[PDB]
Design a protein around this ligand. Structure first.
Ligand SMILES: CCCCCCCCCCCCCCCCCC(=O)OC[C@H](COP(=O)([O-])OCC(O)COP(=O)([O-])OC[C@@H](COC(=O)CCCCCCCCCCCCCCCCC)OC(=O)CCCCCCCCCCCCCCCCC)OC(=O)CCCCCCCCCCCCCCCCC
Ligand SMILES: CCCCCCCCCCCCCCCCCC(=O)OC[C@H](COP(=O)([O-])OCC[N+](C)(C)C)OC(=O)CCCCCCCCCCCCCCCCC
Ligand SMILES: CCCCCCCCCCCCCCCCCC(=O)OC[C@H](COP(=O)(O)OCCN)OC(=O)CCCCCCCCCCCCCCCCC
Ligand SMILES: CCCCCCCCCCCCCCCCCC(=O)OC[C@H](COP(=O)(O)OCCN)OC(=O)CCCCCCCCCCCCCCCCC
Ligand SMILES: CCCCCCCCCCCCCCCCCC(=O)OC[C@H](COP(=O)(O)OCCN)OC(=O)CCCCCCCCCCCCCCCCC
Ligand SMILES: CS(=O)(=O)C1CCN(c2cccc(Cn3cc(-c4nc(-c5ccc(OC(F)(F)F)cc5)no4)ccc3=O)c2)CC1
Lengths: 80, 48, 345, 140, 318, 98, 105, 171, 172, 115
């Protein structure tokens, strides 16, 4: 088969490159460790208002202020 | 290079949008108050 | 035709009506109709003769117009009441133009002038598909909106389909047009009862399908396309005359055959709603439908037309057809009236 | 307008005969126009003027049929004083069929049209009396 | 003020078209071991005005076989669109800021073909019809790859706007990540203009002039100037997308300067190419665009769909 | 909005009228079909933008897709018709009368 | 509906974007969202025959939000009366109705 | 049918800001940390009540807090803030990345003379919890009482009386 | 202004009418291009740009192909125009006059829910989100990739099947 | 409004040029000049006859490819979505099916011209 791939790389290299790039496009996402960050970024963007919630008095995990150290931090995106 | 530049652009977008967030309450108050004013004027004139 | 192309095309034909059935949104019903009428054409024109090309044209233009009309109806019902699927609060003009276009597609009268020709111009295995599998999706649409259909319009359409099917198949020598007009009449029946009870139009559809499919199989056995041709069965395949005669008499609506069951249980459900006149006329003209089936039985089985010096060869040779499904369907299409309660509900 | 064609039943037979005649003549003209449309679209003519001729022919024939039907019906309701009798409508349909024959120049069409239109009109009167329904609503 | 800006954007473009005809002639001459116009004015800076004035002084033709309406509309439309494609261009600030500027470009260009089509059909001459059908083939060939190349590039810009490419290239050209797409886009712009080696719409060696063969002085001048304007336009597009002028908000004049330098380079390259190569056969153009550029174009479209994901380099929406 | 929709409906009706009332040429009828498609696409987009329902914009693009597929098969049938008779006339495909 | 395959497999291919009150991109809202919501919630569990009589108020509010025939009629009548007045000189639009206004904020 | 009530032109009168947009964009990141409470009370009151007439005094309080913020600015650090928003008004989009040297002077000025501190990259973009002394609405949509569903027939399933009551079948 | 969208719709109507009159498919494709341009204009006037530019490109390609085809199959020695046939020109003018009549008589006898010459330009953009960032039309059409995945596979398969089908039809 | 302004300005420029091209110069019209051009000799027929097309299949295919382009164009927005895996998968499936259709056409010799 190597000889076939070789004579194609010599004769019709455009299709060789096409299939190779097809495969790499399909593969590299499965390979990279920076793939998970795409959705995380597209989720971090506040295209809408962060509607606040009523302080029922049972929301310990939720902050009372933006600069209150609670909630999702964006450091992973500030140093990426 | 494009990766890095687009990441910094995303961050700058976060910044702009956070500013918009901080300002939306004022704009909402003004818009509501102004719509009510316009409607009350149109009501007075619909009464005349 | 290669197997890849056949696969794609037949899968598309099958998929079309499935989407229509399994879809809540009208737009996807429309795209299903379109899959159907886009994939069916190459199977018509495959033979590549002028008759096939013009059949394809007459089919494509008609179905495209009807699809555009259905799309207009959907878009108006979207502009109004802001949803896709129809509702009780929808314009009767919309509903009735939709019904008219669905009839146009199905081939009901007076929107039928294209079905006999399109069926005469193509081979038989496609006429089978055309007349059985392509009449479902429209009927699915109609069965999902049956409470909203006007009864005046469907009933006029039904009596017209009955009358025209009878009068048209009355003087046809080609068999394919006879089957086309039979389809027109049985669809008139299917539609006359749809608003009152759509569990009976599905029954009539199933029965008409299992009745016409083996008839088409018989015709395909010796590629018979005329009365004079089937007249030669007593010399070529005399083992088929019994089933042929029984299926014909059933299609006509004679007891004790299960082709009488749709007629009977539709007349009943119509008179439960005081539609005496409609059912009366429909039956009296189904008689005329039966007439030419009987003339055909004469020509084929109950008497022996002349044959040729060459059919001796066909007698010499062997035959692999038909398959198992012909006998099954032809038996379950004549000798199943005793099970009617199981069939009706 | 449908109120017009319903004015036929605002008074019983033997009354406003001329109105019944006009209504039935208009209905016949309607049906003739429909038939002429279907006969010019399909089986067209050699000339547009010939198509208009066919239109006028069929339309005037249908109108005369309806005229005779309504007229004779109301006249028989006026003479023998049996307004609720399908026999008057039978007579009317028979005169209409005799017309249809006169136009076509066929005694056979005359007889067939008589014995068919009379039956149809008598059944129409029977349906208006016994309150039948032609295109009924689904009620079960 | 806006009309004055219209003037400052329009009249220079026409002067540049004229002097582009000039530079074309002189460059091709020096490549062909000859001078080019030097007689009419100092080094020939009046030959374009001479040509144009002479043409608009000639008897135009109203043949007997032609549909005069389209025969007259087509050049109007050609010139109109050639001048309208220059409005949304940032240099670095555009006269009309459009979010879907790329699509405006695409549609207006795909429309400029109907000038050729209707001209060649109206003229009612066989060579005109041949030029028209060749234009049909040429468009059917290049228009598929154009949009996919452009989409694949824009998937790192984040929008169809022509003014976000300036911030995208703020640090580095788009040629480095997309030089294959840049090459294919260059040749496809070469085809969009009916320019050599793709001068098939007016191929003088097969079709005396193509769709122009019945056209005369004035309308012909309109066609010609539309061609030589779309040339500069496509060069500017290449050098705004793949080549990036220096954008410093306090210095847009440098941006315009470098934009102009690069546009001149690309246009001179167009002329170089006209001088250097023979002409294709209009079936080979289809075979090229559909067998070497479209497969590779799809592969690269997928590659640039994935790259922002396994790199976390998705661009922003404004 | 209402006048716009009335005019687009009238336009659909005119294109349908054209499709129904044939002339010698078939491509003209195909073009009338495409005009109906255009009218419907525009009506749907206008409705979705007036309702601000950005979940129904994927619909008109599908309309266009399928309309263009229909046009493609129509052009193929036209090719076959021309090969057979040399012209796209409708008065020539009248042999299925039997 | 005819073949409720979706409701069997528990999927949603075409039913999550039917009406306006459905999930839209970026949590925007189509106009008449609340009217449609209330109509749907009233028509739930009773059928389309009852809903045509019991959710009539809500469906009519929806129909008016969406088509707005009555707001149109009202504003048209107001403009018509105002034109009559101005014609026969019995009205003068205040400043804020003639461009000259206090443009808050 | 029913009337629609609207406040009076005086019931909706405030001390408006009348300040431009580049200035607000300059001061927003600090106006978010210093007026979050009132801003969020107003906006929650807005989404919860879906009526711009019930939630108006909160908006007046928003305007008042913004005025107080900008006065704390105008008193201490008018000139750096001026430089900042003047640099930031020049861009066609009012971008921050073009005025970083002035942003830092402004932020240092405030950090010194008012203790303020600038929010980080993702602090304003998240969901806080606000405590108000207003009750939850009972029916914010003002919906009527839902109709009565149809009764479900109860009882164990049992065969049909005499089977299929068809014409002449015994089952 | 205010007459803008109505003029657009009227021009679209006239284009579709001249199309339905079936002149040589050349001028019919011309009318279709013009009608698509007007449709783009009106869709832009209602808020959306992506769909308008899209339909425009699509119909431009389509009419290119249609020109190529009619020059090969649907041509005549003397192609017909709107002016060529007195009858066609007369019915065209008649249709314009009838549109005028319909409009001017509906404004009078009919209500305002269909045509309101007085009150025009007041009902184009009923509601809007003044503080909004994510309202472009392409968001919806991109929902195909994320949410409305069914429409996408449906259309893609339609095109695949269309390729195979046209090949099979054109086989000689 | 400004786009309308610019485009109308261009319309007017072109039309002015054409007017002064059709009314400024001296004309001398006669049949032998206004007659079609066929390389010095008289046409044997009209140019309004069927000019056969050998790339009709490729044009039909171009229609569907234009539609696939229309479906690919919303990617700049589809990449801003949280459901990124779905967008990636759907785009890959679309482009792959497109390429497979093209390959089938290629192999079955559709891209080659009828001779
Ligand atoms: C032969 C059987 C071979 C023996 C093998 C099985 C051994 C066995 O024990 O079976 C006994 C088995 C069960 O016996 P059982 O349940 O203990 O007692 C029977 C009861 O009396 C209750 O049974 P039943 O007799 O009352 O019948 C129950 C059921 C039975 O009804 C049915 O479902 C069908 C019954 C078969 C008929 O409904 C009916 O009552 C009869 C409805 C009448 C409908 C008939 C309409 C016919 C129209 C004309 C058709 C003409 C031929 C077909 C058309 C082809 C063209 C000509 O009986 C039979 O299988 C014989 C059926 C008798 C046929 C009746 C003839 C009329
Ligand atoms: C949008 C398309 C318009 C659809 C409605 C038709 C309106 C025009 C019909 C009038 C007749 C025009 C015609 O067909 O004549 C043939 C002519 C062809 O030339 P000709 O055959 O009339 O040549 C006549 C020669 N003289 C002048 C000496 C008498 O073509 C046209 O005029 C119409 C071309 C359509 C252009 C439409 C866009 C107009 C742009 C604005 C200007
Ligand atoms: C003389 C008496 C004149 C009065 C006629 C009134 C008839 C109204 C019924 C509808 C028209 C049916 C006309 C007909 O019978 O067919 C005629 C037509 C052939 O035309 P032609 O041969 O020229 O006329 C022959 C007449 N001797 O052939 C056809 O039209 C066949 C197709 C007719 C389909 C009609 C369907 C009507 C459906 C009604 C619901 C809508
Ligand atoms: C008359 C016969 C000759 C006809 C040929 C005329 C030349 C045609 C040139 C090709 C034009 C085709 C493309 C359609 C026009 C482009 C649409 C466009 O770019 O957007 C319209 C623009 C707003 O667009 P956008 O920026 O996306 O929206 C956000 C703005 N803040 O703002 C607008 O809404 C303005 C829309 C008007 C578009 C200009 C059309 C002028 C037609 C003159 C005739
Ligand atoms: C409806 C009732 C029609 C009235 C009968 C008129 C018959 C007719 O003209 O339709 C046929 C016509 C095509 O006629 P054609 O094949 O070109 O032959 C020359 C015609 N003397 O078909 C056509 O002309 C197409 C008409 C479609 C456009 C109609 C829009 C009219 C505007 C109002
Ligand atoms: C053997 S070779 O390789 O050497 C071969 C290479 C090609 N070549 C060549 C190249 C470019 C131009 C020409 C002359 N030429 C000019 C025109 C034409 N020009 C204008 C025009 C309008 C407005 C203008 O601006 C303003 F007037 F200000 F508005 C300016 C010009 N109208 O039409 C049309 C046809 C034509 O042949 C010749 C030389 C020979």
């Amino acid at each position: 088969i190597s000889a076939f791939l070789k004579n194609a790389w010599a004769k019709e290299p455009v299709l060789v490159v096409s299939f190779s790039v097809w495969g790499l496009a399909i593969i590299m996402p499965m390979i990279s460790p920076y793939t998970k960050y795409a959705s995380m970024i597209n989720k971090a963007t506040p295209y809408n208002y962060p509607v606040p919630v009523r302080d029922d008095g049972n929301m310990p995990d939720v902050p009372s202020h933006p600069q209150d150290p609670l909630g999702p931090s964006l450091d992973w995106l500030k140093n990426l | 290079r494009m990766m890095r530049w687009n990441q910094e652009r995303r961050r700058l977008l976060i910044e702009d949008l956070e500013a918009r967030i901080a300002l939306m309450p004022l704009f909402q108050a003004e818009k509501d108050r102004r719509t009510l004013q316009i409607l009350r004027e149109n009501l007075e004139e619909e009464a005349i | 035709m290669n197997p890849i192309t056949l696969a794609i095309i037949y899968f598309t034909i099958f998929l079309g009506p499935v989407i229509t059935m399994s879809s809540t949104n009208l737009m996807l019903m429309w795209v299903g109709l379109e899959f159907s009428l886009l994939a069916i054409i190459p199977m018509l024109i495959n033979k590549k003769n002028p008759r096939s090309t013009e059949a394809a044209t007459k089919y494509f233009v008609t179905q495209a117009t009807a699809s555009m009309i259905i799309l207009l109806a959907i878009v108006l019902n979207y502009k109004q009441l802001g949803t896709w699927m129809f509702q009780q609060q929808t314009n009767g003009l919309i509903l009735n133009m939709t019904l008219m276009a669905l009839s146009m597609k199905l081939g009901l009268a007076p929107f039928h002038f294209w079905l006999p020709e399109v069926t005469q111009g193509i081979p038989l295995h496609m006429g089978l598909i055309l007349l059985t599998w392509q009449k479902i999706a429209p009927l699915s649409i109609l069965i999902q909106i049956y409470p909203l259909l006007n009864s005046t319009i469907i009933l006029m359409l039904a009596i017209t389909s009955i009358f025209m099917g009878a009068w048209g198949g009355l003087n046809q020598t080609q068999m394919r047009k006879i089957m086309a007009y039979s389809s027109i009449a049985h669809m008139g029946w299917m539609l006359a009862i749809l608003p009152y009870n759509p569990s009976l139009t599905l029954l009539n559809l199933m029965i008409y399908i299992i009745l016409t499919a083996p008839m088409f199989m018989a015709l395909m056995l010796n590629n018979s396309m005329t009365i004079n041709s089937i007249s030669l069965l007593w010399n070529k395949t005399p083992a088929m005359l019994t089933m042929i005669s029984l299926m014909l008499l059933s299609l006509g609506g004679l007891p004790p055959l299960t082709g009488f069951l749709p007629k009977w249980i539709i007349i009943t459900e119509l008179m439960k709603n005081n539609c005496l006149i409609m059912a009366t006329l429909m039956a009296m003209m189904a008689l005329l439908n039966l007439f030419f089936y009987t003339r055909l039985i004469y020509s084929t089985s109950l008497t022996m037309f002349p044959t040729n010096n060459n059919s001796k060869m066909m007698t010499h040779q062997t035959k692999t057809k038909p398959n198992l499904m012909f006998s099954t369907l032809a038996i379950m299409s004549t000798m199943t009236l005793p099970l009617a309660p199981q069939l009706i509900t | 307008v449908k109120r017009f064609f319903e004015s036929y039943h605002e008074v019983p037979d033997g009354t406003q005969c001329h109105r019944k005649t006009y209504i039935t003549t208009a209905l016949g003209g309607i049906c003739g126009i429909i038939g002429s449309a279907y006969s010019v679209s399909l089986n067209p003519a050699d000339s547009t003027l010939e198509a208009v001729a066919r239109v006028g022919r069929y339309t005037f024939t249908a109108a005369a049929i309806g005229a005779m039907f309504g007229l004779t019906t109301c006249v028989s309701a006026q003479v023998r004083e049996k307004p609720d009798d399908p026999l008057n409508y039978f007579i009317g349909g028979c005169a209409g069929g005799l017309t249809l024959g006169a136009r076509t120049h066929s005694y056979g069409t005359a007889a067939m049209g008589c014995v068919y239109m009379g039956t149809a009109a008598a059944l129409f009167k029977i349906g208006k009396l016994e309150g039948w329904e032609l295109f009924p609503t689904p009620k079960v | 003020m806006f009309f004055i800006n219209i003037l400052t954007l329009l009249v220079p473009i026409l002067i540049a078209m004229a002097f582009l005809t000039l530079v074309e002639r002189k460059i091709l001459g020096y490549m062909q071991l000859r001078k080019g116009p030097n007689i009419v004015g100092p080094y020939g800076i009046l030959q374009p005005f001479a040509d144009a004035m002479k043409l608009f002084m000639k008897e135009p033709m109203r043949p007997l076989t032609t549909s005069m309406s389209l025969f007259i509309i087509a050049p109007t439309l050609s010139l109109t669109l050639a001048l309208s494609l220059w409005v949304p261009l940032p240099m670095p600030h555009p006269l009309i800021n459009l979010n879907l500027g790329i699509l405006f470009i695409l549609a207006t260009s795909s429309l400029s073909v109907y000038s050729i089509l209707w001209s060649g059909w109206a003229s009612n001459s066989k060579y005109s019809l041949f030029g028209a059908l060749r234009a049909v083939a040429q468009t059917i060939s290049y228009e598929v790859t154009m949009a996919i190349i452009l989409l694949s590039v824009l998937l790192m810009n984040g929008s169809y706007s022509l003014q976000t490419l300036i911030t995208t290239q703020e640090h580095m050209w788009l040629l480095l990540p997309a030089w294959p797409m840049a090459m294919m886009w260059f040749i496809s712009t070469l085809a969009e203009t009916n320019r050599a080696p793709f001068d098939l719409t007016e191929g003088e060696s097969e079709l005396v002039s193509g769709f122009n063969v019945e056209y005369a002085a004035g309308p012909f001048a309109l066609f010609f100037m539309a061609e030589y304007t779309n040339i500069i336009l496509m060069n500017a597009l290449t050098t705004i997308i793949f080549l990036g002028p220096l954008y410093y908000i306090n210095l847009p004049e440098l941006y315009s300067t470098n934009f102009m330098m690069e546009a001149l380079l690309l246009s001179s390259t167009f002329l170089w190419i006209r001088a250097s190569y023979p002409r294709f056969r209009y079936d080979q153009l289809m075979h090229l665009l559909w067998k070497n550029f479209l497969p590779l174009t799809l592969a690269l479209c997928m590659w640039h769909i994935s790259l922002p994901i396994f790199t976390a380099g998705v661009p922003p929406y404004m | 909005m209402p006048s716009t929709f009335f005019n687009l409906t009238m336009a659909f009706s005119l294109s349908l009228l054209g499709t129904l009332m044939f002339r010698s040429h078939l491509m003209s009828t195909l073009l009338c079909l495409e005009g109906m498609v255009l009218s419907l696409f525009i009506m749907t987009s206008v409705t979705s933008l007036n309702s601000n329902s950005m979940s129904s914009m994927p619909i008109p693009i599908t309309i266009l897709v399928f309309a263009a597929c229909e046009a493609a098969v129509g052009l193929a049938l036209l090719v076959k018709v021309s090969n057979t008779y040399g012209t796209d006339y409708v008065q020539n495909l009248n042999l299925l009368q039997c | 509906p005819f073949l409720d395959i979706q409701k069997k497999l528990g999927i949603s291919l075409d039913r999550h974007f039917m009406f306006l009150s459905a999930e839209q991109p970026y949590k925007n809202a189509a106009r008449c969202h609340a009217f449609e919501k209330e109509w749907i919630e009233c028509a739930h569990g009773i059928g389309g025959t009852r809903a045509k009589k019991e959710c009539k108020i809500e469906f009519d509010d929806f129909e008016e939000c969406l088509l707005r025939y009555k707001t149109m009629r009202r504003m048209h009548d107001i403009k018509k009366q105002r034109e009559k007045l101005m014609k026969e000189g019995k009205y003068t639009p205040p400043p804020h109705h003639s461009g000259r206004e206090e443009p808050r904020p | 049918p029913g009337i629609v009530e609207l406040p009076t032109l005086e019931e909706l009168k405030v001390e408006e800001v009348k300040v431009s947009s580049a200035v607000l964009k300059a001061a927003a990141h600090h106006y978010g940390a210093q007026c979050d409470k009132t801003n969020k009370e107003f906006m929650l009151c807005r989404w919860e009540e879906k009526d711009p007439r019930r939630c108006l005094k909160e908006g007046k309080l928003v305007n008042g807090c913004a005025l107080n913020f900008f006065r704390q600015i105008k008193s201490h650090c008018a000139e750096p803030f001026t430089e900042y928003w003047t640099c930031l008004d020049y861009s066609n989009m009012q971008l921050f990345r073009h005025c970083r040297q002035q942003q830092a002077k402004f932020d240092q000025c405030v950090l010194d003379k008012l203790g303020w501190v600038r929010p980080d990259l993702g602090q304003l973009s998240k969901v806080t919890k606000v405590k108000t002394d207003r009750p939850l609405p009972e029916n914010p949509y003002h919906s009527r009482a839902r109709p009565e569903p149809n009764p479900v027939i109860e009882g164990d399933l049992k065969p049909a009386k005499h089977g299929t009551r068809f014409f002449f079948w015994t089952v | 202004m205010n007459n803008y969208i109505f003029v657009l719709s009227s021009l679209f109507l006239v284009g579709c009418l001249g199309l339905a009159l079936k002149p040589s498919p050349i001028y019919g494709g011309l009318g279709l291009i013009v009608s698509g341009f007007v449709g783009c204009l009106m869709v832009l006037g209602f808020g959306g740009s992506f769909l308008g530019l899209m339909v425009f490109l699509i119909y431009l390609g389509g009419m290119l192909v249609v020109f190529g085809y009619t020059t090969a199959m649907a041509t005549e020695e003397y192609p017909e125009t709107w002016g060529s046939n007195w009858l066609i020109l007369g019915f065209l003018v008649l249709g314009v006059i009838m549109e005028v009549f319909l409009i001017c008589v509906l404004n009078y006898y009919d209500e305002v829910g269909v045509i309101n010459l007085d009150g025009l330009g007041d009902w184009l953009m009923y509601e809007v989100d003044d503080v909004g960032v994510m309202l472009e039309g392409g968001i919806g059409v991109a929902a195909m990739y994320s949410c409305a995945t069914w429409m996408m596979v449906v259309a893609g398969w339609s095109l695949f099947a269309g390729i195979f089908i046209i090949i099979e039809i054109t086989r000689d | 409004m400004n786009l309308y302004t610019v485009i109308f300005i261009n319309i007017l420029l072109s039309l002015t040029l054409i007017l002064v091209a059709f009314w400024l110069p001296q004309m001398n019209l006669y049949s032998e000049k206004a007659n079609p051009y066929e390389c010095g000799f008289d046409p044997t027929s009209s140019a309004r006859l069927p000019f056969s097309m050998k790339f009709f299949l490729v044009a039909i295919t171009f229609l569907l490819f234009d539609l696939e382009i229309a479906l690919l164009l919303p990617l700049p927005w589809a990449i801003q979505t949280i459901k990124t895996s779905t967008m990636m998968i759907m785009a890959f499936i679309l482009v792959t099916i497109l390429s497979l259709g093209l390959a089938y056409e290629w192999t079955q010799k559709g891209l080659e011209w009828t001779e």
